[PDB]
Design a protein around this motif. Structure first.
Motif, short mmCIF file in Angstrom:
data_model
loop_
_atom_site.label_atom_id
_atom_site.label_comp_id
_atom_site.label_asym_id
_atom_site.label_seq_id
_atom_site.Cartn_x
_atom_site.Cartn_y
_atom_site.Cartn_z
N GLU B 1 43.54 39.54 63.60
CA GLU B 1 44.04 41.12 63.30
C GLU B 1 45.44 41.44 63.81
N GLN B 2 46.20 40.94 63.40
CA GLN B 2 47.59 41.11 63.83
C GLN B 2 48.35 41.71 62.64
N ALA B 3 47.86 41.59 61.61
CA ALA B 3 48.44 42.43 60.45
C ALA B 3 47.45 43.46 59.75
N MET B 4 46.25 43.28 60.14
CA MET B 4 45.17 44.11 59.52
C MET B 4 45.22 45.42 60.39
N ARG B 5 45.11 45.53 61.65
CA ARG B 5 44.95 46.59 62.51
C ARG B 5 46.29 47.51 62.13
N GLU B 6 47.28 46.92 61.75
CA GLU B 6 48.65 47.48 61.33
C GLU B 6 48.42 48.16 60.11
N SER B 8 45.73 48.71 58.28
CA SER B 8 44.45 49.77 58.41
C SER B 8 45.34 51.11 59.23
N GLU B 9 45.97 50.84 60.13
CA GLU B 9 46.49 52.07 61.05
C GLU B 9 47.37 52.92 60.10
N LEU B 10 48.27 52.24 59.46
CA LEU B 10 49.21 52.98 58.71
C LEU B 10 48.46 53.90 57.60
N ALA B 11 47.17 53.55 56.95
CA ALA B 11 46.48 54.26 56.02
C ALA B 11 45.54 55.43 56.77
N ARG B 12 45.05 55.03 57.85
CA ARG B 12 44.44 56.23 58.52
C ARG B 12 45.33 57.32 59.07
N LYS B 13 46.47 57.04 59.44
CA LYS B 13 47.41 58.00 59.85
C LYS B 13 47.83 58.98 58.68
N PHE B 102 44.23 47.08 49.90
CA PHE B 102 44.34 46.89 51.46
C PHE B 102 44.38 45.58 51.94
N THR B 103 44.55 44.53 50.89
CA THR B 103 44.51 43.23 51.13
C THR B 103 45.86 42.56 50.91
N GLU B 104 46.19 42.59 49.60
CA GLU B 104 47.40 42.01 49.08
C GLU B 104 48.74 42.79 48.56
N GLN B 105 48.40 44.24 48.73
CA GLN B 105 49.58 45.00 48.40
C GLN B 105 50.50 45.11 49.41
N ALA B 106 51.66 45.66 49.15
CA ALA B 106 52.73 45.67 49.98
C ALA B 106 52.40 46.86 51.29
N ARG B 126 17.79 63.42 42.29
CA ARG B 126 18.61 64.06 43.28
C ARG B 126 20.02 63.56 42.91
N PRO B 127 20.86 64.79 43.26
CA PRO B 127 22.51 64.31 43.11
C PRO B 127 22.82 63.31 43.96
N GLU B 128 23.69 62.31 43.45
CA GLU B 128 24.15 61.36 44.35
C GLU B 128 25.68 61.20 44.94
N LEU B 129 26.23 60.94 46.21
CA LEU B 129 27.24 61.20 46.53
C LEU B 129 27.98 60.10 47.21
N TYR B 130 29.03 59.69 46.83
CA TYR B 130 29.41 58.43 47.62
C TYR B 130 30.99 58.60 48.09
N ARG B 131 31.28 57.97 49.21
CA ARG B 131 32.59 58.07 50.15
C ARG B 131 32.98 56.60 50.02
N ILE B 132 34.21 56.57 49.40
CA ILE B 132 35.01 55.24 49.54
C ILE B 132 36.26 55.40 50.39
N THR B 133 36.37 54.55 51.25
CA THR B 133 37.53 54.76 52.44
C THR B 133 38.57 53.74 51.97
N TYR B 134 39.79 53.63 52.42
CA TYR B 134 41.06 53.24 52.35
C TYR B 134 40.71 51.50 52.44
N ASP B 135 39.90 50.98 53.13
CA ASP B 135 39.41 49.56 53.41
C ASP B 135 38.34 49.00 52.24
#
Lengths: 222, 212, 214, 224, 214, 216, 222, 222, 222
Positions: B1-6, B8-13, B102-106, B126-135
């Motif tokens: 995780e020397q490239a992943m924490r980054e 991911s970081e960039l996305a969360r910010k 979040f794996t092979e893009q620039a 009953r209504p369904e709600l889904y949350r999809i995140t950056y990863d």
């Protein structure tokens, strides 16, 4: 060859003859032309044993493929569309002579009225479909004879038993007027095959039950 | 995780930087409430008959995803049938797309998506709600999804103000209030169950002022 | 992370080096005023019937984008219809293209784009102005757009002097005055004239320009 | 097969017969050839009767696909252009005998005058379109009989009701002179299908209404 | 990103600095191209189209490639549309795009500097145009003269003091040969875009005929 | 970037200094090619087209690759247009472009130095043309002689000192062998000419007995 | 349509008629069939007036393209080869009916003898060429009549003027015997076009000189 | 057209006629059909002029190309194989009407016996090659006539001069009986072309020598 | 159907009829066949409507596309070239029966003489173009009748009003002798459409001005 299908209160029944011809020559007497394709559908193809078992085999695979991948079965409209696509994909080969016209019988488990939930769908050369609103339909070389028979006998259809009787009689009338359709062979003990579909699913009608109806038709006509 | 924490970081910010969106289940279906100033750029959209979309983050990135989802849904309906397109199916495909991105893009996509589905006309579900995140992580929520900006004040203001079968007028006020905690400047839409085929309806201008 | 910060820096400096451009809404449509010494190299152009383009930055890069937009607009109008092409659509496409370049390419485009749209003949709709930046960010601006060079001074001057339904002559002076704060020739002038039947884009030059000036 | 379309003040109506034939033989009695393709349009396809549902299904998807992607409906001209390309893309298959000529009925929301907002567009073999300026049009094997009937009846169209009734009568007249077009079957209760489009959108006319209309024509012409 | 971009910019700049100088200037007749060239077979100046000329400085194999691609471009456009549809602005634009792509995408940037010049069609009056395209794709519209390769500053200064609009062919040639001496027939390569000629403007002034004017 | 192109330039130039020397000079009857080549089997000198010759120094497999691509080029052009339309300038130009691409694009640069020479057509009057194309694609037009490979300065100085325009074949061969020795025998040489006096194919090798009898 | 070409001492001349026909109908009266293709060549095309115009333009572009790229013009042999290739490319098109046979006239600036430096080259369907060593040649529907006229008049060719008179007379004869070739129209003032090529290059012959010759031929036969 | 080829002691000679026809009409009188393809070979092609004229040229290029690339010329067997491949690559075009049948004459410098080192190879439609041990061969519309003539006169061939004389007489005989083959035109001074190949290489036989032989054959039969 | 075009001093006028036929059956009465393609040009297409409808729209897009990209409009010659290219492209589809022959009318803003700056260009099947020197041209099934009418009436053309009269009379004459061309319909008020182009640009002639002209022609012939 002739394949018939009809709607009765609470379901649908599909039946097909057992003959196969190479011109005038009888090339088969045991051919199965009607197959259960999933829990609530059955397909009958007018043609050779293989192009009837290979088409039904592929469609059955397609339907169960969706069910496993998505967790639920395809809708009946969805089932129709998939079959229409399969037939359309065989248009290039149908210009040579390799024509295969299917007839689909099914029970829509998602229909409002369970009494009229039976479905009959026919397809033309181009892969065009038509959901039959008349109650019965037939495909194959003896289809006109079978449709004209059912036209006079359909009013006697009140349940699964009477429906199956009308189906067998229609197939009898088809074989009586069309040499390419085989009638019940009392000597060899070979009879038309049938599938009955209601709310409990698609079931192969046993040979003994059809044999009893065949004999009754024969005894009623002599 | 020397490239992943980054990556991911960039996305969360980026997601953190962005404005807020709220999606909640009510009596007549699903209500989408987002903080949107622009007249013509939309964060809320129709995917299919009963399926809606809401997103938070960098526009060009979530509009690309919106388009791809419509592309997917329309192709699927045609191959099989419309009744066969579900919110689960779309959420699943967004999960798979975001994950690959979040794996092979620039760089990772700076977005947070919500796919919502209501029942078909005259059906009870009953209504369904889904949350999809950056990863690509996919979350399934029973009551509500909150995305973009400062999520915690809005999520807590909602957990205290949430009811099972609230009216349209009630659910809209509970949402507007939650947003402050976390017409113009507001994008509002509903997946209307009583509608025969296309559930999606936009609540704009005069009609939006009239309920509050 | 810290490298996408440098890309942002290279492009911004480049835009700063280039001459400024102003786009503002007026009574008869949208007005574009640019500081252009060049005679044949243009920062302002027609995209489609009611859509105009203006850019700032490195020429070879924004001309590439100008061409692609015309390419896009002409293809969409042919596949659907003319009335189906909008400024939002072009702004959207530019944003997507700019972002891809910003991320995938070696060097980002040192450009800042403005897509403007006026109403169709005899239709009533307020003019739309979109600013698309080097990274693909898109903004919807109600009254005016300022790109290239020293933007704050120009923008402040405009902000103070802007009038919503100003005359073409009035709007031209308000723009030329706002452009002097960031320091018929060396000026490229054009309008999206909502009053023309189909093609709204019209260049204002020479004698016609002069009368407007005074 | 016959499909008719006519403009009335405030809208447009499209109707089609239910017959299918294989040569002389009647292969179908319940074929539906008229379909709502979006909120403001309907298409009727003649020939290759089984395929009518399929052509409409693809066109509907294309219109909707655009609307969702771009956030707005295509212009009516755009709608026309898409349908023209679909037809042009089927010229190779039409040389074999798989010919499908569509008739498009729509209401233009963007039109200046609401009363004259209804539209009718017809297509030829090559994929060429024509916006009808005369008020009515028809396609299929009974089209000439239907157009000649409407030529004498159109003057009495003043609203949606009388427009629907001229359409049913045109279809009836076509069935009268063309065996490939099916007239209303009072025995089985099968009648032509119809779509009516005005400012409130495209709506399927209930079988009930086409039925009362047909009986008023047939039963009275007969002894009834 | 920066030192990398500065390094490539440095390699290019040094290669151009190492090459012989070329001068292009407007004159009453048309355009005059004078280059320092000891060779008799390898050309730095060339015809592109009817009214369009080319001049380059730097690494031969690289600018000859560009010269050929331009003739390729011009002939194709003229054939697809019409001859009068080919312009110097169009060719300068395409060189800008080519050089620019090469600058970022290619392993080594092109150590070249290009000049595209255009003259009026026969019987027409339009001030000549001169475009300067640099290694990175930057394009400059110049109104009087262009200097490329070697020690441009000294050459340019001499011209700037020296240059007069609408000069005679002989005067222009001497003004150019004199300006070239400030930075350093057998040596020279001369040619003009003679606006007098009916279709093909390009002409080379060679041997005996050059000795007269020198 | 810069450091890298300088290193490719050094590799190629060192691989050329290691190689055996070749000399190409203009004389009365055309162009004479003299190379120091111990091997009977491998040739540094070859025909390209009717009036065009080739000479090279450096890594064999690399310059043979170039020799082949030139013959390929020349034959295709001569077929697509006409024979009299293939010139030495054309070939030198294409070698410049190829070497330039290899120098920039490939994993390793070619450690070669090429000479393309052209004589006049039968019964035509034109001074012989000699072109030197180097590893980086630089092309130079020489009017009298070209020296490639090995220790070129001594060879070139000797040539500069003894060059005479339109010298006899016997004279030019001695001036060249004399020049080669300065920088370094029939068994030890590869000699050939582009004889401007032949009807079409100018290229002619001078070998064995004929060569010996001429070395005097 | 008829196109003629003949060698005179010091050059070559090429001339062509102005008619265009759609079956029997005269569809054009002002058609230019002969075009200067470079400083020393001219092409005349007969057949489809459509495959004609776009032939000279493309060949002219090709010749110029080579010169700009290489710095010298193509050898005459090279010019022939490129033209032959163009014709060969269109052979498939020809099988339909779009046959376009060109006739090439030129002056070889690199020829030994300037007196016989004029060149005439003809092409066949296959794209095959032949350098006319006889002194004259013609292509088109009236080519036989033109060649037979020139056979009797060629001995009168001593200079550019007598050469052009024979070319115009050949075309007159072609038009006299072939309805698809147009004769000089004195009423509308339309005359055959011509190009003359010598050491000074290819030049369009002015209409007035041809008109003068046409009237002299008409008086001579009247 | 007709092309002949014959072996003499120490070499081979190939000669061809100058005629060209478009149906009945005479389209050419100056056509050269025999070309030196390398130092020791020559090809004559009979068939459509467009493919044939080009044909010698392509072959000459292939032979020379191999020689420059490999340093040594191709063996005689190799030269044959290359020509066979060229002909085979034109089979698809030969079904239309573009038939080109070549005849190859050569001197094998690597042969044991220098007296019989002359070689004649003929090709058929399919691209199949044959070597003639008879010592003479011919191709074209007049080939049967020429071959029959040669059969009678081959005995008289003792050296190159008599070989050439027989070749010219065979062509005279071909023209005498075949209208598509042109005889010697004494009025225009046009005669058959010929190439003679021995240990010293292939050389075009001059016009005056052939004229002397043609005149003597004419005197001899008059 | 018929389309006419003619030069008048200072301009060009193009007009077309409104009929569409499916064999003998009148399939359309209001068809518009003349369209303004840019500020200074108009196109009229005869043949297949599907091809015709597409050609004008595409051509217009092409001209405008160039203008926006390059900042200047194409030359008149370029405009012709682009149209010619589109027509050739459609040749494969023209062999089937989808034939579309366009007629181009324009005003060359860059011409020397403004009086004769009007331009008429016609195209044939192959995609070949021709610029008319005679002053008028027509395409379509009634073209011969229209051209023969204009031949007698063109001397009366003195301005845009008289040129539009002759154009409408030519179309009247076309419809009088050709059933595939529609004449002016007084009952329905449908009249031919026209475009007039001068130094001020292309503009649609209003229905009312055409109508006055038709009545005058009708009154003149009664």
């Amino acid at each position: 060859x002739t394949i018939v299908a009809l709607k009765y209160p609470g379901g649908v029944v599909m039946a097909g003859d057992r003959r196969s011809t190479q011109g005038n020559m009888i090339s088969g007497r045991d051919v199965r032309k009607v197959y259960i394709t999933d829990d609530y559908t059955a397909t009958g193809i007018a043609g050779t044993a293989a192009v009837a078992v290979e088409f039904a085999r592929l469609y059955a695979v397609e339907l169960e493929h969706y069910e496993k991948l998505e967790g639920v079965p395809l809708t009946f409209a969805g089932k129709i569309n998939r079959l229409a696509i399969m037939v359309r994909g065989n248009l290039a080969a149908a210009m040579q002579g390799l024509l295969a016209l299917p007839l689909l019988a099914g029970y829509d488990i998602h229909a409002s009225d369970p009494q009229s939930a039976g479905r009959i769908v026919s397809f033309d050369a181009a892969g065009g479909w038509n959901i039959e609103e008349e109650g019965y339909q037939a495909v194959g070389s003896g289809s006109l004879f079978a449709k004209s028979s059912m036209k006079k006998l359909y009013s006697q259809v009140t349940d699964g038993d009477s429906g199956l009787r009308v189906a067998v009689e229609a197939l009898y009338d088809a074989a009586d007027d069309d040499s390419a359709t085989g009638g019940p062979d009392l000597v060899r003990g070979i009879f038309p095959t049938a599938v009955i579909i209601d709310a409990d699913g698609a079931v192969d009608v046993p040979e003994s039950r059809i044999a009893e109806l065949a004999r009754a038709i024969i005894e009623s006509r002599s | 995780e020397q490239a992943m924490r980054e990556r991911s970081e960039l996305a969360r910010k980026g997601i953190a930087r962005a404005k807020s969106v709220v999606a909640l289940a009510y009596a007549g279906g699903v209500l989408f409430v987002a903080e949107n100033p622009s007249r013509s750029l939309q964060k809320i959209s129709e995917l299919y008959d009963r399926v809606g979309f809401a997103a938070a983050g960098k526009f060009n990135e979530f509009d690309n995803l919106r388009r791809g989802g419509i592309q997917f849904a329309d192709t699927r309906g045609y191959a099989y049938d419309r009744r066969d397109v579900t919110g689960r199916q779309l959420a699943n495909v967004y999960a798979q797309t975001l994950g690959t991105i979040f794996t092979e893009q620039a760089k990772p996509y700076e977005v947070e998506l919500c796919v919502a589905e209501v029942a078909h006309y005259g059906e009870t579900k009953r209504p369904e709600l889904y949350r999809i995140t950056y990863d690509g992580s996919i979350a399934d929520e029973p009551h509500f999804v909150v995305m973009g900006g400062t999520t915690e004040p809005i999520a807590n203001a909602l957990k205290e103000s949430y009811a099972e079968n609230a009216s349209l007028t009630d659910a809209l006020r509970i949402a507007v209030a939650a947003l402050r905690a976390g017409v113009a400047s507001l994008e509002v839409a509903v997946l209307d169950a009583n509608r025969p085929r296309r559930a999606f309806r936009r609540i704009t201008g005069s009609a939006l002022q009239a309920l509050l």
